[PDB]
From a paper:
In the case of Sqt1, we were able to decipher the mode of L10-N peptide binding by X-ray crystallography. These structural analyses showed that the C-terminal domain of Sqt1, which is preceded by a non-essential N-terminal extension of ∼50 amino acids, folds into an eight-bladed WD-repeat β-propeller. Moreover, the binding mode of the N-terminal residues of Rpl10 (L10-N) by the eight-bladed WD-repeat β-propeller of Sqt1, as revealed by X-ray crystallography, allows establishing a refined model for the final pre-60S maturation events that lead to the stable incorporation of Rpl10 and the release of Nmd3. Taken together, we propose that Sqt1 may protect Rpl10 from aggregation before and/or promote its incorporation into almost mature pre-60S subunits in the cytoplasm. We conclude that the β-propeller domains of Sqt1 and Rrb1, which harbour the essential function of these proteins, recognize the very N-terminal residues of Rpl10 and Rpl3.
To this end, we also performed in vitro binding assays with the orthologous proteins from the thermophilic, filamentous ascomycete Chaetomium thermophilum (ct), whose proteins often exhibit improved biochemical properties. As a first step towards the elucidation of the recognition mode of the N-terminal residues of Rpl10 by the predicted β-propeller domain of Sqt1 at the atomic level, we independently determined the crystal structure of ctSqt1 at 1.94 Å by molecular replacement and of ctSqt1.52C, lacking the dispensable N-terminal extension, at 1.5 Å resolution by single-anomalous dispersion (SAD) followed by molecular replacement using the ctSqt1.52C Se-Met structure as the search model. Sqt1 and ctSqt1 share a high degree of overall structural conservation and mainly differ in three ctSqt1-specific insertions located in the loops connecting β-strands 1c-1d, 5c-5d and 7c-7d. Analysis of the electrostatic properties revealed that both β-propeller structures notably contain a negatively charged top surface, whereas the bottom sides exhibit a charge-mixed surface.
Author numbering: 54 to 105, 127 to 223, 228 to 331, 366 to 466, 489 to 540
Write the structure that this text describes.
Amino acid sequence: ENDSIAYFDGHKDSVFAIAQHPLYPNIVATGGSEGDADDAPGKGYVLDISAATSLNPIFEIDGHTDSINALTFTLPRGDFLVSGGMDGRMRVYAVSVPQNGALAQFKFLAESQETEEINWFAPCPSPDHPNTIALGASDGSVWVFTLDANPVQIVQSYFLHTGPCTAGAWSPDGLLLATVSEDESLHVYDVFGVAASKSLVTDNGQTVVSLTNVDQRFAVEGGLFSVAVSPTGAVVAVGGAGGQIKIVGLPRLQAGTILASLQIQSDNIESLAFSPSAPILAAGSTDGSIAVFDTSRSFALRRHLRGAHAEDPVVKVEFVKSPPNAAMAGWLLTSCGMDGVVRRWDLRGGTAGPSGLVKEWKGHRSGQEGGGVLGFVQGETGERIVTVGDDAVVLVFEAGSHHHHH
């Protein structure tokens, strides 16, 4: 019924976004809508989960005149907290986390509003370019900013998509940024100019891969909604309408060709994740299923988990980076859905060539009752999961790998 060990009910309506500090997993920001009126503002909070039953915020994020839709702490060390709204506002806060005193301080620095609606954030993982963030917007544009020193630098502003930019993902080296659109296009941007210097950019001078609706072998009718890049940076996966997934080659810094096409599930692929260390790709669908493909076997189907979240949308799937049982590295997947449940899966099973349900966490309302889980973070080890719900609640769950035996 309710597996949570703590909660936060301060949001007045849908909690759309959540971010976790990269060094301090107890520091989590949540953001969403304060109501359904046309003029309802957005609101965010910063929480300290180490206090985990009712949580009290350590900071409040004000200034958004519409729902907060995106949050991120910057890489590598969370120097900034950035909020992004349906008002197009990007608000930048400096973060200080004193190992001495009672910790976290947050200071507003700047606001940028180059678009009307922010759809997503993705921090750049390049160690060479700290505190760099990308976003995609409803006008199809993709912006890359660096937070340094006019504290907001514009690194890139791209206008290649012609419809809403629905998702973005960096390559692991942080040199490429892959984004997708409702208009069915994929563009992979040479953000820092490295590919251009190696004569690996397309005719438009900006991308290393550009595929659109005119490319018949690529076109996914109804649009693209998710994107993920493999751990070696060798391929990008895009997911879209009708359960379709396309695998496209990237240059290593071969490029732009379709290496595999998939369509096992029946509705929008809303979430895609490559395992960080097992040769598998997981896809979550609006139809409630998760599908697992073997990346070293032409993306053969390993397992089709029908009803992973009943017949409600699978909103997010994400691999546990460093599970307590080191032997399970790369094989443990956490998912959340509009059924109001968070689940974790052991993906070793299935057809691997030459259920797997591990744990369920309940507490949110289902979509049918006005809830649904819209997002989560789970730290490095997956042992503490913090959720955001359409039922305006934030929950904290634990995996309990440490039994504290006597």
